[PDB]
């Protein structure tokens, strides 16, 4: 109801100099006015799509918070079609910010995405919705698969960190923003039935650039520093990569990307908008089940001769070598039996060695046959399918290496396979869950800068940046940005110490996984420090 | 040899600022205390709670929390509280001294300011116990157990803790909370005795705050932003804020007006508040009347109902739409029937018909001989959030040439009264964007305009919020340590007002949601100087 | 381009530049992620020691403990508790030659990290670790080996380099005391815990961010050290003595399960919502609750009252009606309802706490293929308290009934749960059992409350959804200021904090009444940190 006597007695019962924590002198700031400015741009096909935006106005003193709008068209026709999650980020191949004196800042599309991955709002705007990312089906040539939509891509820049204090100042200079787009093939998930040829011919990127402009009265410009991300991709299947000309790096990131060039980029399933590891696994199990347990009158027809479809015993247990599969379906008609496809997908490099068989990954399958729809309605499924199984390209099941067929699904099931060309996949699975780096070594010149076995550098990245999707990262700067010059690793060119060399030991994937034959590329990102000066327009100088 | 050199700082090689040590300043001597007050209740019979803060030792205060003791709800019928029940109770909050109002806010604006604070919304409260629609079976059955909810009354005094705190220049502070009618916070069916509940219900509030007893306080003048709201006329796409001299921001949004309805909806998902939960609760409510397993043509439906026996094929054609219906274990003496016009809307006898039965493409299930019900399995439909937000009144409106609610009397009896006061847009999730274009005028000159909702995208990015509004921010300067940046008036040139004009998106006249009345809401934050000369006072910056 | 109205509104007074800053040159330093193996020592309590000393490691912060979990092989049910890595920790101590610099009890470290979802995930929390897995053969793999990471949050992390621990050419020892592995594992009777316990060893590794600083200019600082007092079992009071400069005081309750075998009917695994706990429990009871049998069901104790369901579908258990309807029941069989599955009472013709009475509707379909009932819709009033009742309390001496009338199959599936960080009297700490709280500074009442308004403030101020009744005395920003504290008056006897609570009561006929409670009181004392002749701390008085 009021302050207690014990508290009152503990204070009254003034000799020392105290900092006022109950009042502040409200400083008058620089006089300015912000404005959201939107620009249309010019489209070019060098046949890569490139959008240019020129910002040249005597009243736009500073700017930040770049947002790119993209108009997605109405998608009509036959077939399965869906956009990749965060489709807007996946459109971007490269972003460049330039003045008359050259590039001020630039970034690779995947690195922009990596920098925004911990911003759920920016990712949502990108966008990510059941409307965009579920795999929709067109049943007629004039059927609407996808309605037209607008996505917003937040182009995070070093100018956003401290709002007005970090904004790009325009020294009565012309700024150009150049966005290079990925082919539309990257952002779209589709089956064979979908007329991609026509879609590709007719699709056009329709972008618009927004930014927060500031009209500042008597701006007092000071020099600053900015970090420019630089990326190097290693050779296919080489466990090494080098970044040359490293003189002042604030950080270094290391990750892996799969390379699907030895494939047709076709996968059995995709979960759509639902993106959890369990959603990927459930979408895959769901696609296999129709061919795995068959309720038929006599041995099931329409499967390759290589298929081993066995009638389930009265026991319910089918033995596929060491693995027992318990199959029990209720309401099976008297003229019909329950069959198990014991080798739905199988892989082996040697005829009497190890076999990777997807049918062996199921231990229990129960359900009820429906006389009304003539389908089996699966109830409980016990299995050991993982995220890697859902990430195996179909090409690797039917590869030359494989001594077996070894894709014994029905023709109906194979026609439902999807082309996935997402350009920002990491690791060897869709969720980048499996850590395939067993050991990492970083060399600065000839000296070992850092080495680790487990991903403790990923744990630090995730803790320090409050991200649940980090990468193995070394950070050399722990100083607050903008108010301090960033701390860096510094070169010694005479001792040949001006290169960062990364070496990894990859995990053997275990014994005979078809995912061992997924080609990998090592990615190394280095953040170089640059000085930003505004003497005769905006200019940047690499720190050396 | 598989060993690797383990050497430290191998990447290492004037006045420098020390980043490894700091001089720990001695702060003002103070002592905080959590103080709780009961108030005085007063009653167009609107409930008002007053709390008077007067103590020579409370030097400053912040972090206001209002407690509310919700009563035990007994009786027959369906009852549930709206999500974030405690915020929806608040009509208005006012903080006053002897010199007048220091700060005040409309209930919806307090809620909009706390929408990103998941903790404060949970305390509000939001739970299965409060928000699921509970059913009372006997007149002495307990529908809802008594409960306490906490409403964090976010004020400008919390931004920088002690630095931004409200200083009581040995003045009396009065906090006045105006409550919304209990009708607004309760979701109920016709069976529930609302008349008695309303007569007997009383708001039981308590105000807490963090008080600070400060030794030799050195008070300095400061600035405060006071939110000011203007609501446009029904269906008017314009609104004006007059006497704008120093504004830090301007927000624009839409609210539906349900005065042309009885505020009854077919369904409500309860505690589960996702778009999918709203859609699933609605589909679930329609399914008992949509697919019927009956011995002969189903009874108990209006004559306007067109209930058709499903062919051996399983496909029923409703004009251009094919509905595949297949139910297992149907008894031999019975057939499967499909309600082909459960809900239908047309403005002309030969116009386009909006039919909810046409929104279903596949319905799978098993009839239960034990419970004499159909247990639905897989449903393929195209029901959206707008369908679940249609008031029942609009389906049976004078503008409809059809009946056009052909549901059973049992289904219509399960309809719920929803009077949530903080609904935005034309659907429960505020998913549909109905503003096609926005123009903001400062005087007669165009300050800002947009076609797409880029100002909402910026609001959401800058405030890290997933529920933003079209907002124009003029202040990008850090709060408390600087005088806020404002849009400033030119009275001589007539630039002393903010006029908002929107262009609403169009839609077909044959969709019941076309008849939802809309109100434009404009929120302006005006800058005020906080003085302490003879107790606390605020002065509008002009 | 900028509109004319904006240009016209702009185009003697000192203005602060908000569009440019002079980029200060910081102290020259170089960070490094350093990892150390320690020394393992053995109540045969496991203790890991890590010694940090290097002429170039000047400062450090952001301690992360790695734990290598082994491959778990054999027969039976096994799972790790959620946040396994935090639950491993009994105590963490940071020491110099001059003594302890900072230390914390494992539960208080966990409490400090509970609002950090990333740190908790790294702990870890996954279906792989936390679902209850089953081993079918003696060489079957129940759990694959895994690594967990425990972020050991310290006061040195608040302001990165500014708050970092400086090493004045001193040797810093980090000592981690581990809980017995019995605390972090959820297992059934079938699992060979004896062998697992004998063979299990903690395999830890300590990482930290080390800083090599050129010409470090050290300044004295302040640190808050958490101090915990646990009250006598069921005693609603606790005292913290020698309180001279405290920044906060926290109060909470813990259950004590020493009067039990720590066995529970169910556990939801990785799925940790209140509903997941309730659904896992209902699921475990269902196969004994509704039985499809040819004649009266066999294999239940003589005390079991299994009744054939009438044609009506309604079975009356006193005042409670249970509607049971199962489809596809074979002609030679009937539907039976177990009317006293679990029952508890302290007198014979009095009140009965009966779990079977908590069900109002049960629907399902019998499966001829698997000879099971596949349950569909269930209407019950089971709560989080029911799922938190140890099995021991159903069959206790106070109970005049049997009163666990489940099948032997169901009882064999019971799980040992020894999670060391449970609060309240239920697994979710949902039930508030403190009716009133009083805090005394000396003999004077410092604070008192009925409702948990101090928990509401804790949750608001720390942006946490799992707060405790807390009194904060410090609202001053950390590192840049000396913390504000409650200060002692030794002459007036105000140099101690006494807590008294009034517990709510659940009835004497509820098995949960017999769950023992412990009052926990946490006090944060202010200490001065000085670096004159190694690192040392001094209690503020």
Numbering used by the authors:
A (entry chain B): -1 to 11, 14 to 46, 50 to 547
B (entry chain C): -11 to 1, 16 to 45, 49 to 547
C (entry chain A): 0 to 10, 15 to 45, 49 to 547
Would you copy out the relevant sentences from the publication that reported this structure?
The crescents are covered by a protein scaffold that is primarily comprised of the D13 protein. This protein has no predicted trans-membrane domain and requires the N-terminal region of the A17 integral membrane protein to form a honeycomb lattice on the external surface of crescents and IVs. The crystal structure of vaccinia virus D13 reveals a double-barrel organization that consists of two jellyrolls (J1 and J2) decorated by another β-sandwich forming the head domain.
Here we describe the 2.6 Å crystal structure of the vaccinia virus protein D13 and establish its membrane remodeling capacities by analysis of 2-D crystals and reconstituted IV-like particles using electron microscopy. We determined the crystal structure of both native D13 and D13D513G. The two models only differ in minor loop movements although several loops could not be modeled in the native D13 structure because of its lower resolution. The two structures have an r.m.s.d. of 0.5 Å for all equivalent atoms. In our model, residue D513 is ∼14 Å away from the adjacent trimer. The 3-D density map generated by electron microscopy also reveals a large gap between residue D513 and the closest surface of the neighboring trimer confirming that D513 is apparently not mediating a direct inter-trimer interaction in the 2-D lattice. Thus, mutation of residue D513 does not appear to directly destabilize the fold of D13 or the honeycomb scaffold. The surface-exposed residue D513, which is in a conserved patch of D13 is available for interaction with a potential cellular or viral partner.
